[PDB]
Amino acid sequence: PASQHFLSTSVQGPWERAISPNKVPYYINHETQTTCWDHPKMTELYQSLADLNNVRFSAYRTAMKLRRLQKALCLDLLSLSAACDALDQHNLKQNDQPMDILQIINCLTTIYDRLEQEHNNLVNVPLCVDMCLNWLLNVYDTGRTGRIRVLSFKTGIISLCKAHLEDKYRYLFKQVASSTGFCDQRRLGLLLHDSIQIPRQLGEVASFGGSNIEPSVRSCFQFANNKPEIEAALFLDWMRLEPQSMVWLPVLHRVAAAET
């Protein structure tokens, strides 16, 4: 893998970055002679998230965890316009198609290079690429296949970027709606399924209705009076009620506004 040279500096000390057969990275600890699938800095972040386990309300606890992760990945510096610029340059338009590890890296590298030139040593590019990469594979490729759907990549980065909440909602709805702006139950399910993997990766899916989002699709279509398809305004109106499957997202925004 030609990208190995570039991302080998994301680790040091006793650690060494390596690659599996499906091009998925893994890390070697020489002092302790062990191996781990997660980047050492990501492990340290996941473990630190237990210091939030006594935060009382589920939506608020999960948002504070995702705020810390978002900042560790520098995704709070990424505007929706800049993300769309990178998605556009890498031709990621077919949302049902797979992206492999090198396409993930390439798109992340354009994103973090640009963030680095706008922010003063806030950004170490090889490090940021490799940690975001590890987050995305922990969320969407738990089978270690070396690929994720383009819809999935878009859902993770846009849910954690710095855009206004309604702009994220409009953008995600547009990724699953038809070319004329309509969504049926199947298409809404695609969006809610990718979204629910984010809290699921943190061990919190039980407070967001669980891993089957079919009850949440049915509830939105019931709210829409059982019509065969809905448009973005109706979706935005349902989201104002903060449905349980997605309530961690508006709460993440309240978290960031409150300062953290």
Indicate which CATH number applies to the domain containing 135. Answer: 1.10.238.10
For residue 133, give the nearest of 16, 41, 33 by alpha carbon.
41
Q: Are residues 227 and 213 in the same domain?
A: yes
Q: Are residues 68 and 115 in the same domain?
A: no
Angle, vertex CA 65, rays to CA 62 and CA 68, nearest 5: 150
Structural domain including 80 reads: 74-164
Kindly tell me the number of DSSP H helices and DSSP E strands found in the chain. 12, 5
Domain boundary among 164, 180, 207: 164
Q: Are residues 44 and 28 in the same domain?
A: no
Cα–Cα distance between 89 and 86 in angstroms, integer?
5
Q: Give the chain's radius of gyration (CA, Å).
A: 18
User: What's the order of all strands across the beta sheet hosting 25-29?
Assistant: 15-19, 25-29, 34-36
**What six digits make up the tokens of 33?**
């002679």
From the number of C-beta atoms within 10 Å of its C-beta (0-12, 13-18, 19+), residue 101 rates as: buried
**What six digits make up the tokens of 73?**
């990945």
Three-state DSSP state, 146: coil
CA 190 to chain centre: 15
Q: Kindly write down the DSSP assignment for every residue of 5-40, as one continuous string.
A: HHHGGG--TTEEEEE-TTS-EEEEETTTTEEESS-H
Q: How would you label 44-83 residue by residue, b for 16+ Cβ within 10 Å and e otherwise? A: ebbeebeebeeeeebbbbbbbbbbbbbebbbbebbebebb
Contact 182, 240 (CB under 8 A): no
What is the CATH classification number for the domain harbouring 4?
2.20.70.10
Q: Are residues 189 and 251 in the same domain?
A: no
Contact 13, 7 (CB under 8 A): no
Give Dmax over CA atoms of the chain in angstroms: 62
Q: Are residues 8 and 29 in the same domain?
A: yes
Handedness of CA 159, 165, 168, 174 (dihedral sign): positive
Q: Are residues 239 and 259 in the same domain?
A: no
Q: Kindly write down the DSSP assignment for every residue of 230-252, as one continuous string.
A: B-HHHHHHHHTT--TTTTHHHHH
Contact 145, 22 (CB under 8 A): yes
Contact 22, 148 (CB under 8 A): no
- Considering its fold, how many domains does the chain have in total? 4
Q: Are residues 214 and 160 in the same domain?
A: no
- Region of 242 (left: φ > 0; alpha: ψ -120 to 50; beta: rest) is left
Q: At what angle do helices 165-176 and 80-89 cross, to 10 degrees?
A: 30
Q: Are residues 219 and 237 in the same domain?
A: yes
Q: Are residues 99 and 118 in the same domain?
A: yes
Cα–Cα distance between 232 and 27 in angstroms, integer?
43
Q: Kindly write down the DSSP assignment for every residue of 61-99, as one continuous string.
A: HHHHHHHHHHHHTTGGG--HHHHHHHHHHTT---TTSEE
Domain boundary among 105, 140, 164: 164
Domain boundary among 164, 185, 218: 164
Q: Are residues 79 and 33 in the same domain?
A: no
Cα–Cα distance between 130 and 191 in angstroms, integer?
25
Q: What is the structure's resolution, reported in angstroms to one decimal?
A: 2.0
Contact 111, 170 (CB under 8 A): no
Q: Tokens 């829409």 sit at which residue?
A: 224
Element (H, E) at 100: strand 98-100
